[PDB]
RNA sequence: ACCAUCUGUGGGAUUAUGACUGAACGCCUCUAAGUCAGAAUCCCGCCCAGGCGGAACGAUACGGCAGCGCCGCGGAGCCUCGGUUGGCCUCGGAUAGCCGGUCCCCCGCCGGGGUCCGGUGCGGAGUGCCCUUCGUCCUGGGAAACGGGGCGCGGCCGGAG
RNA sequence: ACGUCGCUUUUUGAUCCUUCGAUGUCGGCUCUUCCUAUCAUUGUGAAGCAGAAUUCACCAAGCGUUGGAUUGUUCACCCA
RNA sequence: UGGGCCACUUUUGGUAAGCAGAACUGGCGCUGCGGGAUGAACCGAACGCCGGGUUAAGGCGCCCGAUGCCGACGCUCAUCAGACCCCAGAAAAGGUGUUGGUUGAUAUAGACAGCAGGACGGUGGCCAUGGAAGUCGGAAUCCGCUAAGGAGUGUGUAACAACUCACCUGCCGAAUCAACUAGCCCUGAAAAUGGAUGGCGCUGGAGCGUCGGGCCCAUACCCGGCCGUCGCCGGCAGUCGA
RNA sequence: GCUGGGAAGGCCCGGCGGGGAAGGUGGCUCGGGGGCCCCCGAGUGUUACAGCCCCCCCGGCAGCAGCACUCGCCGAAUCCCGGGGCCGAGGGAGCGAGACCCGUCGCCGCGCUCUCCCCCCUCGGGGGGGCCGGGCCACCCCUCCCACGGCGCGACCGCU
């Protein structure tokens, strides 16, 4: 039933801690609780990291266990993990949450007006569709 | 002695010079201590038992923190220790995996406290050695020597239980 | 909050939920806990039943009519636990206790509402999967609660009604998505405005 | 000590179709359907092959207590396979010293009446578990055949009969009356 | 007045205990997960009392000015008690998994199965959604025009915990 | 058995903390409730348990545990 | 005033005592305040009346101020669990519950466990006797066949017989066994009104061991205001606009 | 600022190599899942179609307790800015004119003027550059003493 597995090369996304919000690559595994983790292209130098702050993504990189950061970066840049991660819906959701939080009062005003008009249009269309499906009478 | 995140100290000491012997020998010890003060205290405690030396009748010529040589290399530590249980004294040998020798020793103190109710003053470290995976003996460590190690995290308990404290959606554990 | 906070008692640990609710009612909030028979208790059922039987044995020897009133209904049991967590012998404590409403099953005033869930109290995250736990409904029924049957049937009927309502809600969302597909051209600019500021990925 | 993984595999015979609805295993075969959910055990059940049809039970980070549930689940599934392929037949030999035991099979073998156990007037009435059929033998003198698909239910019915036939206030080493399960086997012996 | 006569009752979860399947520990095993039988015990029933606890229902103040109920937001007001400062009108649930959508089979034109397709650190997301108040007057482009509002009348349906 | 570790406060001691500007001090009768370290009864396991009778132990205190001669007696013994 | 009492350590009588008597220091008495739910003596700290800040001991699920930390590592399931000096309850002895540790041993020349074979001859060995043929006992402990078989580990017979094990081999393929030890838990573990980690309750911990960051308040500490006292036997007769 | 004049680390495919092993790369053998070609699992090993550790003949470059949050102790080797809260006790400080409209006063820290040229804004008012010599340090040379540390070379004394 499991689809994501901690292993050598799995790309993890850090949720909290000093390195929160960055992608990293699992290099090695220790004691069921920590992993030697090193994300070179994402500005995380090699260090141990608990599994609790990791959220595995669907990307797996190919390199030997405990290889050096040179080879980790080589694999990462050949895979273009930055662009693929940007393409995924997870990072899109995170970006949208961030840009929703950073909204100013004027942007909130514009959002209110646009959403008001958009919901008016959509609701009117829904009423039309309900009429179309309501004009049926045949047992 | 209490704990924290232990740091290893090389402590070099000697007896004070006497007319009998103007060049008393120097002795080195590795003390895993919270700070240099406790390192010196534990050094004097240990050399009092090992040799006929005293803090007052001797002096410490050096007390320096030993940085980890390879803090990015996962490695296996075997710790020979002896400790005072509630009903005697026993020697133990334990296995750990850590990026630092001092971290392995801190793990040893925590593990002895959890498993044997032993305090840091009872525990008495007498050897810490980096050993090979083939030389490992405890299965809890031996099961991590696999180039194709792979496991999922089955039951991710939500740790942000109070943020939000009230919500309409029941949490999902599978991830 | 000034509104009435409604909690769905299914799957919540008894003490874990009562501790939150006591603070809430002390802070001037109105709390309504429904479906109190679905509250779990950690530890195995026979142990929990033994604990409640001991509470049953605790009574005033001289006159049991004055002694500890052992309330049998699950809602009353949860209410008593909340009372034990509250300073009920003062006026403020009595007001806080009166701000709370407890129910076995879900009455009509609340069965047409949205029910909140407290993650910090849920059995799923406050119990390891290997531990045994007991249902307040079974425990109360076996210690004297006489209405496990009627409540079960009424709850199943409410489940059927809410299922029909949910079916209609699904139909409404299907129509809403179809209407968005219809007026994509008309609302394309407002969609851009929403997207730039992060609503509607 | 949390072992990283403990896994065990069971081969499915060709004429048996096993479906996984979560942790609910549905085993279908020539003798019918056996259904059982293992929702009280947190495991990873998966079906692997296309011709072999292997079924793997995985348990990650299992300590000593739950490491033993893997073989339990595999054995229960193999019991389901055995039940839907060959069925379970428990042969019980009713032994008595003096008083013969009158065993009467009522409606469609779901009710067993023990009449003259130790020569008394009370008639024991035992209702077999659903889907379990009782019979009085023809090749044997005092023998009962209990046939079914769920081994749990079949053996529980056999135990019901055996514990209905119980001696009281007597030296049980002397009074050896009762019905005891002589052997446990299958139908069709395949 | 046992100094006469009459009446005195059912179920459930289970204790001890005996078993089932089945590992741990390629054998065994009543136990570890999951099951079974089970008692002057326990709990309820039957029996007694009936909450500063509720229900349904009835009648509801004169032969003289005399009371009252309901309808009007009908008006004018007095006295007294204060809180609050948008709403959310709802599947069932699982957590070693979920949710949404579609083509075939059943049961009366919809639901349930199976195939297929999607999403899943839940975006068909409560970290969410809906409404969003300065008001008018010229005055155009868009949405609309199958629309909006009636403390507007009359009718139908549904909701019983 | 020789030893050894406990529990209880239904015995008798040890002490004198409370009460001497007073807590009515033995026993019996009456009457209620509680404990179990269970005598009987329910369900059980065991025996040098064939049956009967008996012996040990378990869950267990719901119900019962009597009439009299002597004695102020509690205790003691007997008759039934 | 000349009745003292309590606590750490030392210490005498006593089975012991919230008993009786000594030494040192502190305290209570004579003392309030924070904490130990509660408490003469324990922990902190001693006090004029207030404001701000910060601590002590102790805590931070709710009662009840504060962990509503995305705390760390492990241990533990109790059908009488556990939960903090004084302290308000327990022992020896056990456990194939689980964990850690020590020591020893067997093993791809095939472990261990299961299923399956063999389990012999001198010799029904000597005394012992009523019968003791391996198995009631007193002594001896050898040999050959062997792959191995003990003049025997048990069950059994009056003795035999017949089963069983030591011991060898087959099938099986990869690790396995035993003896100790100390952590939690369980047994050991029984009293009277109904009742007590303070209660509620708590089992991805609100339990136990070892640690981190925060945070909470005492009459304590710092700063400031005010009152009074004490001290400087302080200053002022110079009102000397000349 | 100091440390091991920090430890590791990043780049220069680090180049010349050596040695080693597995948590064993590729390949090869075996047994399996996909229509004689791919994936999975068990053995061999020394680099192969991945890599890891140790030694160098030596490294070089940025950075340096890192504004890529890996692991310290501090500030004569330490400064600047901002926010929140509580507070306003005291009441004749003038040696000066001989006070008189009234102690904007003591100590401490500064600015301008009683000298003059200019520069840049502003319609007289603002912002700046100084204005002549001294030393001492930094640069070059060569130059003394002392303290400390290490290394070599002796004379004496003592320990064989
Ligand atoms: Mg089997
Ligand atoms: Mg008998
Ligand atoms: Mg009568
Ligand atoms: Mg049992
Ligand atoms: Mg049953
Ligand atoms: Mg006295
Ligand atoms: Mg008096
Ligand atoms: Mg009196
Ligand atoms: Mg009296
Ligand atoms: Mg008893
Ligand atoms: Mg009674
Ligand atoms: Mg004394
Ligand atoms: Mg005295
Ligand atoms: Mg005093
Ligand atoms: Mg004091
Ligand atoms: Mg106090
Ligand atoms: Mg206390
Ligand atoms: Mg204060
Ligand atoms: Mg407290
Ligand atoms: Mg609070
Ligand atoms: Mg105990
Ligand atoms: Mg810096
Ligand atoms: Mg003032």
CSV table of C-alpha atoms (C1' of nucleotides) in Angstrom, one decimal, chain H residues 52-144:
chain,number,residue,atom,x,y,z
H,52,C,C1',34.1,4.6,-0.2
H,53,C,C1',38.5,4.7,3.3
H,54,C,C1',44.1,5.4,4.3
H,55,C,C1',49.0,7.3,2.5
H,56,C,C1',51.0,11.3,-0.7
H,57,C,C1',56.1,14.4,-4.0
H,58,C,C1',52.9,18.1,-3.5
H,59,G,C1',48.5,20.5,-3.8
H,60,G,C1',46.0,25.4,-5.7
H,61,C,C1',41.2,28.7,-5.1
H,62,A,C1',37.2,31.2,-2.7
H,63,G,C1',35.3,31.1,2.2
H,64,C,C1',36.4,30.8,7.3
H,65,A,C1',33.3,29.4,13.8
H,66,G,C1',29.8,31.1,6.6
H,67,C,C1',23.9,36.6,4.6
H,68,A,C1',24.3,27.7,1.8
H,69,C,C1',21.2,28.0,10.4
H,70,U,C1',27.2,21.4,10.4
H,71,C,C1',30.1,21.7,15.4
H,72,G,C1',32.5,26.6,20.1
H,73,C,C1',34.4,30.3,23.8
H,74,C,C1',34.1,35.5,23.9
H,75,G,C1',34.6,41.3,23.4
H,76,A,C1',39.8,47.4,26.0
H,77,A,C1',39.3,41.5,20.8
H,78,U,C1',32.2,46.1,20.7
H,79,C,C1',29.5,49.1,18.5
H,80,C,C1',24.8,51.4,16.2
H,81,C,C1',19.5,51.7,15.7
H,82,G,C1',14.4,50.7,17.2
H,83,G,C1',10.1,48.9,20.1
H,84,G,C1',7.1,47.7,24.8
H,85,G,C1',6.1,48.6,30.0
H,86,C,C1',6.7,51.2,35.2
H,87,C,C1',8.3,55.9,37.0
H,88,G,C1',8.9,62.2,37.3
H,89,A,C1',11.4,61.9,43.8
H,90,G,C1',13.8,66.8,44.6
H,91,G,C1',12.7,72.4,44.3
H,92,G,C1',16.7,79.9,46.0
H,93,A,C1',22.5,75.4,41.8
H,94,G,C1',24.0,83.3,40.5
H,95,C,C1',31.3,84.8,44.4
H,96,G,C1',27.9,87.6,39.6
H,97,A,C1',26.5,92.3,38.3
H,98,G,C1',26.9,94.7,43.4
H,99,A,C1',21.9,91.0,40.8
H,100,C,C1',16.4,94.2,39.9
H,101,C,C1',11.6,91.5,33.3
H,102,C,C1',14.0,86.7,34.8
H,103,G,C1',19.8,81.9,38.4
H,104,U,C1',18.3,78.8,30.0
H,105,C,C1',23.3,77.4,36.3
H,106,G,C1',27.8,73.7,38.3
H,107,C,C1',30.9,69.6,36.4
H,108,C,C1',31.5,66.8,31.8
H,109,G,C1',31.2,66.9,26.2
H,110,C,C1',31.3,69.8,21.9
H,111,G,C1',30.2,74.1,17.6
H,112,C,C1',31.2,79.0,15.6
H,113,U,C1',33.4,83.9,16.0
H,114,C,C1',36.9,87.7,17.3
H,115,U,C1',42.3,85.4,10.6
H,116,C,C1',41.4,84.5,5.3
H,117,C,C1',40.5,82.2,0.9
H,118,C,C1',37.6,79.1,-2.0
H,119,C,C1',33.6,74.9,-3.5
H,120,C,C1',28.2,73.5,-3.9
H,121,C,C1',23.0,74.8,-3.1
H,122,U,C1',19.7,79.0,-1.9
H,123,C,C1',17.7,85.4,-2.5
H,124,G,C1',20.6,87.9,2.4
H,125,G,C1',20.1,82.3,4.0
H,126,G,C1',21.9,76.6,4.3
H,127,G,C1',25.7,72.5,3.4
H,128,G,C1',31.4,71.8,3.0
H,129,G,C1',37.2,72.1,1.9
H,130,G,C1',40.9,74.0,5.2
H,131,C,C1',44.7,77.6,6.5
H,132,C,C1',51.8,76.3,9.1
H,133,G,C1',54.9,73.3,11.4
H,134,G,C1',55.8,69.2,14.8
H,135,G,C1',56.3,64.2,16.3
H,136,C,C1',54.9,58.5,16.2
H,137,C,C1',53.2,54.7,13.2
H,138,A,C1',52.5,52.4,8.2
H,139,C,C1',56.9,51.8,3.1
H,140,C,C1',62.5,51.0,2.1
H,141,C,C1',67.3,50.3,4.1
H,142,C,C1',70.4,48.7,8.3
H,143,U,C1',70.3,48.7,13.6
H,144,C,C1',70.9,48.1,19.5
